[PDB]
Design a protein around this nucleic acid. Structure first.
Ligand SMILES: *CCCCCCC(=O)N(O)CCC(=O)O
Ligand SMILES: [Fe+3]
Ligand SMILES: [Zn+2]
Lengths: 455, 93, 120, 78, 107, 108, 94, 77, 97
DNA sequence: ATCGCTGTTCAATACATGCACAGGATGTATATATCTGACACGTGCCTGGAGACTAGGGAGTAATCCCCTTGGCGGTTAAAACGCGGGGGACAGCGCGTACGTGCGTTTAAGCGGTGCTAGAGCTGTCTACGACCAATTGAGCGGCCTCGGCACCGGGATTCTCCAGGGCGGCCGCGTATAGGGAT
DNA sequence: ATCCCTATACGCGGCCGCCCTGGAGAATCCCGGTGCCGAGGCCGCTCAATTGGTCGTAGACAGCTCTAGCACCGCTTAAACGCACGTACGCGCTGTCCCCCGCGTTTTAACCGCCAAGGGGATTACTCCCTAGTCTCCAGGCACGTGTCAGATATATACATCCTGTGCATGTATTGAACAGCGAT
């Protein structure tokens, strides 16, 4: 099972038990500009976005110069770009700036209001537009547009079409963005997502699932207050997660400066403005508040850069041992990337090598102890762009071999099983089909194909 | 013996509304039956009206009320007008 | 023989919705309707509010004679007659709907039940 | 004022009438039908009352108007 | 002494005397008012004249002089007031009004 | 004169023969009323009332009640076929309806 | 003030005959009174029409019996006619 | 003897009523309906005639029976 | 062999029989049926010719009206053919069953 | 840059319905001709309507009471209104095979014209019992009263249906299997 | 005479399946408890039903006529029957999309209790106007008889219509061409 150890890690090491003054705890974060396409497209900018030195960078006015029609992303032409769709919204209380008090009205507890809800897109558009101008020209309540699917380029054609005049790594997905290579359309992960919000809108702090780099463009006209934190302090969250009871993953919480102040976690406080762009570096746990009526276009990418992969796989391992749900299959992604990418760095070379070898070994052992003692070892074939199949009794990724049978269902739908849950099923496995889509010979051939180009 | 029917008067009314049109025998029987039906209806309704109000006579009031209760809307309006005019002319003479 | 129909849930990325306040228990659509049918088919109380019915009756009567006062038993009898008429009309409308192989009574069912009964 | 006969009341009437699933547009049609029926019966009752030279519609007037329509009613008078 | 039929006095064609006798001998009330027969005869004559005019128009629309039961049925069933007054009446040899449901008309 | 015996007693009835005779005479149904019409009509009315009341009492007993309310009368009328035919065009105020659900509306 | 006659006095006696330990409510009593009045009106009107058809001026037991045959449905008609015949025989005999 | 109302007769009646297609089982249904209607009307008429102490069923008796059932008939007195 | 498509002579017959007033049943079979029905109630009955004519006219009117209502009941259930269930529905909704 | 490969995006091509559109059978609206019997009129008279007076009770008008119909106020409590998520049902569309419509030949019996017999509907005269009418009387039923038990509300537990799981024992499917003996060398 | 070698009867073990079975949880029902108001029996009275006798006519009865209801025949032919064919239509199955239902939450107004005023229903009282009744006079309308013209039946005709086999036209189920992304050289 184990696929990782202290053999592959570019992750810079700092200790959470540190001391920091106000300057270090509140320093300006590395920022840059863009005066031509070559700037962002040049490796200097992309590396700056893949550079561990800066927790996050601001590409100020990037759209302001190239002039892509991000105003078409405006909820106005959004309604004139959609009448009916789903807009998931997190109901939350309109606190002023950073004063998310509690019932008693004089405390700042870590837990934050984060409740699910949804309706038609035009419903949220009406609500947000009406609450705009401050509801036709603290005390207030605010529905919070979140993760509004945009995986279709037809109804949003101007948007996605004009959203390609930028570099591939800052682009939705391309050979410089490993998300393209997963053969999937992870919602809110590899297909850009637009989320509208009103002043004070707050997405509780977090690290983007799997620790990718994030490309965020608030098309405005709203602004945004920010709280960025570098990846080192991540377990620091966990620390006060125990103190204030909240959790670091999948929970709800809006930190306050003093909250992590005993954590001595600095705060890269800054903002943006209509049309700007920003790169939230992989590993930056950020808590944002749209202080004005705005709409974000945000998604996640990882350049093949070495630091990205290592900063990311930590979350994958965490989730695997924390039974926590991930949103990107690193195993499968590592494969297609190691299969059709110009890997040209020894660091990432061995980095992938180790866990890929572990994948080979565990698939080997699985089929070995279960070939004839198993149950009809099948060869599905892995038709192109098969959705990554995830267990449900444990959720863990199932690669190559799998346990899928039609679990009743008047329409005969199919449910998936892994070795970990094959246990709860019965002795080893007794009842569920086995369907492995890659013969060990083919996967070994692909492994052999993996090489470090001299680029 | 000697029967009685409205055929003698139904032919006068006909001559007053369609001077050159005649009527067959079946049609005349239908007309006589229709007059009998409407007479029975109105007389019965007027009798019920008189009995309800603890009275023992049927007058123009009862007939007019029965016409209003049995006739549907515009027929009723025109019939009431014609009946009131007829009673006025009868009294004046 | 070739199954090739394996399936699973679709991935997505969303801001966490902590708490998860939800109401799981629900009756299937229709059972509570049958419960209401049974409950109202063993009772005798009127199913319409008295004050709204009185207001409607007076509004209608305003077009016949002005300053028309109503005995309480008069309005009660009018309500009884109207509700019995509507219940019978609904029984016939439901019969028409079942005839048309449906379960939902539509305006066409009411119109057919009225036409067949001779009420224009 | 016809809106006093509300959706829940029409639902209760239909339930007593044995209806299980009710279309959205049936409420307006029921309101129209009830208005027509009430207009007819009330016109007959007002005629009866006017005959007696009165100004209050008595239960007997409503009973007579209903029996005139072919809908005899028991328990509100003769 | 000079006779004068009450029909002439009221200006009617239907018999006021016969209507009065029928009202008296039909057991409708202990007494019959002077104007009751006149009103009832006037109403009967009005209804008869209206239906007769409609039937005559219908017959002339068929190129005929004599009115037959078919023309009476057409007059009664075409006009809404007369149709409602006689909605539960069957006229012998009257026939049915010409109608066909559009659903049945050829595609 | 002799001890006045009510006309109902001679007919062996409990409905008013004399009152029915009064109503027939004053209702202007006929010029004259025979001596036997009131007795026959009273007997028929008493029989009909006895039938309806027996059915209503059975319905009330089924309900575990001592008195008879209009609901019991409606049940008795709408159950018996002949009584339902006689009173088909009648509505009993505050009586309700006979429970029935179309077999297709029952849960599948 | 002024009196109002009703069939309640006799309806209760009939009820005591049928069920000797059961009562009746006021609303049910009004319903029964209305039923008696309605049936009386129906039978009397049919008998009057029968007498008018045959050029008679009196309503006899035969007119009432034929009206009962015409109005009451099936078995009820036979039972009512039998009862009425027995009642008239008892009345005339005594 | 009830079969004397032939299928063509019922088809003619339906045509006058407006029916375009007629099922094969409708003729028996129509025969039953007609038998019930005629039974009611004829029982009423025969009672009417028997009251008058007669043996002939007059046209007036049928008219009175129809008026009593609820079908007023014009053209026979 | 000029054959008319199904339903084209039916409409011609509908128009022909709606334009007319003649009694659609043969008089002799109807007379025999009436006599047979009557013989159950009273024996050795004699019928006036006018009485039989009135009975036939009333029966024709009743059946024509019932067929109109049954045709309406059939069209509602998306059908051009009338069937016994259509007639039964027309009779139930009519309060005569 | 380019000499190849590649996915998209456009236009061009073929095809079957909508619809003219001929003919041609078939049924229909029509227009003149002819004759029948039903309508429209006249004739006599005779039952019913009108003129005239009486005599009496029903209805109209007024005066008064007091019932009950309206107008209103407050709080409480269920019921209405609004919004949400989801599954169950309405509607469409396609396949099919079955039963009804059409037309033609065979033939059953209804329609029709006379014709005679008689059962009975219908009229007329008699008179007799029975129903109306009236006077006197009393006791049956109606208007109030009081009261006391049946029913109405209440609470609290006892089934009890709904409504999701989870299986357990019957089915078919289907993969595997053993093969071996008629064919071919 | 011997090798063969794959399709066939064999099996067995997975595979679905179709119900059964369990808890959990909203529903509704039933047992015990307390309390109120309405139904039931009593009492006083007054007016309606009974008794008892008389008057007049309505209907029951007998006698008698002439209508029309029934029954026959003998025939014409109009319609009902039966059959063969095919088509379109009723009915089942599948798919989707969406619109009602079950539920929770806010609000709102229905409802109950009580107060308060007065409008009009309900009654009694007095008076006269009008309706029933009676008698007589005579006019209209009913039954019966006559003729003549409107409508039905016939024919020959011209025309409206429906069914089927022609054509173009067009938007689309199906081709090549013109954009390109894309990469090793
Ligand atoms: C997986 C759901 C979140 C997607 C990542 C974006 C995010 O979490 N945001 O809060 C958006 C904030 C922004 O940068 O615009
Ligand atoms: Fe984040
Ligand atoms: Zn698992």
């Amino acid at each position: 099972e184990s696929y990782l150890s202290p053999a592959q890690s570019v992750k810079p090491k700092i200790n959470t038990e540190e001391k920091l003054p106000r300057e270090k705890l509140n320093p300006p974060t590395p920022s840059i500009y863009l005066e031509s396409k070559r700037d962002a497209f040049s490796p200097v900018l992309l590396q700056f976005c893949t550079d561990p030195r800066n927790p996050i960078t601001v590409i100020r006015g990037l759209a302001g110069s190239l002039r892509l029609n991000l105003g078409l992303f405006s909820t106005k032409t959004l309604v004139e770009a959609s009448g009916e769709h789903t807009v998931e919204v997190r109901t939350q209380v309109q606190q002023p700036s950073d004063e998310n008090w509690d019932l008693t009205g004089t405390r700042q507890i870590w837990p934050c209001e984060s409740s699910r809800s949804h309706t038609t897109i035009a419903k949220y558009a009406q609500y947000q537009a009406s609450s705009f101008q401050e509801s036709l020209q603290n005390h207030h309540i605010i529905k919070f547009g979140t993760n509004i699917d945009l995986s279709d380029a037809k109804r949003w054609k101007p948007q996605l079409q004009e959203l390609l005049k930028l570099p591939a790594f800052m682009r939705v997905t391309s050979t410089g963005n490993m998300l393209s290579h997963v053969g999937h359309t992870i919602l809110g992960m590899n297909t850009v997502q637009l989320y509208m919000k009103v002043p004070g809108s707050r997405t509780p702090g977090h690290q983007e699932n799997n620790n990718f780099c994030s490309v965020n463009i608030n098309i405005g006209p709203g602004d945004c207050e920010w709280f960025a934190v570098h990846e080192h302090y991540w377990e620091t969250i966990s620390a006060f997660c125990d103190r204030h009871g909240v959790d670091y993953l999948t929970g709800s919480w809006w930190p306050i400066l003093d909250d992590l102040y005993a954590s001595n976690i600095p705060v890269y406080r800054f903002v943006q403005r209509p049309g700007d762009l920003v790169w939230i570096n992989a590993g930056t746990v950020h808590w944002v508040q749209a202080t004005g009526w705005c709409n974000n276009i945000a998604w996640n990418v990882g350049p093949l850069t070495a630091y990205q992969y290592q900063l990311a796989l930590e979350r994958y391992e965490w989730n695997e041992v924390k039974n926590v749900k991930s949103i990107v299959p690193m195993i499968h992604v590592s494969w297609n990337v190691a299969r059709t990418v110009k890997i040209s760095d020894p660091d990432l070379f061995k980095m992938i090598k180790f866990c890929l070898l572990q994948s080979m070994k565990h698939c080997q052992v699985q089929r070995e102890s279960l070939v004839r003692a198993g149950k009809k070892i099948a060869y599905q074939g892995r038709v192109k762009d098969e959705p990554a199949y995830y267990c449900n009794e444990c959720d863990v990724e199932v690669f190559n071999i799998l346990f899928v049978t039609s679990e009743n269902g008047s329409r005969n739908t199919y449910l998936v099983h892994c070795e970990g849950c094959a246990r709860r099923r019965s002795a080893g496995l007794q009842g569920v089909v086995v369907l492995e889509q890659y013969r060990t010979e083919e996967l070994a051939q692909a492994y052999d194909a993996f090489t470090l180009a001299p680029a | 013996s000697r029967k009685e029917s409205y055929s003698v008067y139904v032919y006068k009314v006909l001559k007053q509304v369609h001077p050159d049109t005649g009527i067959s025998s079946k049609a005349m029987g239908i007309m006589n039956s229709f007059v009998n039906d409407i007479f029975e209806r109105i007389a019965g309704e007027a009798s019920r009206l008189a009995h309800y109000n603890k009275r023992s006579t049927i007058t123009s009031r009862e007939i007019q009320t029965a016409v209003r209760l049995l006739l549907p809307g515009e027929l009723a309006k025109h019939a009431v007008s014609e009946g009131t005019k007829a009673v006025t002319k009868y009294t004046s003479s | 023989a070739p199954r090739k129909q394996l399936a699973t849930k679709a991935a997505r990325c969303s801001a966490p919705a902590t708490g998860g306040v939800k109401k799981p228990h629900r009756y299937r659509p229709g059972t509570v309707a049958l419960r209401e049918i049974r409950r109202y088919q063993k009772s005798t109380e009127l199913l319409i509010r008295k004050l709204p019915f009185q207001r409607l009756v007076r509004e209608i009567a305003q077009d016949f004679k002005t300053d028309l006062r109503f005995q309480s038993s008069a309005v009660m009898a009018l309500q009884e007659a109207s509700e019995a008429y509507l219940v019978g009309l609904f029984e016939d409308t439901n019969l028409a709907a079942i005839h048309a192989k449906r379960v939902t009574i539509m305006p066409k069912d009411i119109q057919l039940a009225r036409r067949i009964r001779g009420e224009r | 004022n016809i809106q006093g006969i509300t959706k829940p009341a029409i639902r209760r009437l239909a339930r007593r009438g044995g209806v299980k699933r009710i279309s959205g547009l049936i409420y307006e049609e029921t309101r129209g039908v009830l208005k027509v029926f009430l207009e007819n019966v009330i016109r007959d009752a007002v005629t009866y009352t006017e005959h007696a030279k009165r100004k209050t519609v008595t239960a007997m007037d409503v009973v007579y108007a209903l029996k005139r329509q072919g809908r005899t009613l028991y328990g509100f008078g003769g | 002494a000079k006779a004068k039929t009450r029909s002439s006095r009221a200006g009617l064609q239907f018999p006021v005397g016969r209507v009065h006798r029928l009202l008296r001998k039909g057991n409708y009330a202990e007494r019959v008012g002077a104007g009751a027969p006149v009103y009832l005869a006037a109403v009967l004559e009005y209804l008869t004249a209206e239906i007769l005019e409609l039937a005559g128009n219908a017959a002339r629309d068929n190129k005929k002089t004599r009115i037959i039961p078919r023309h009476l049925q057409l007059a009664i069933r075409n006009d809404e007031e007369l149709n409602k007054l006689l909605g539960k009446v069957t006229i012998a040899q009257g026939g049915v009004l010409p109608n066909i449901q559009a659903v049945l008309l050829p595609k």
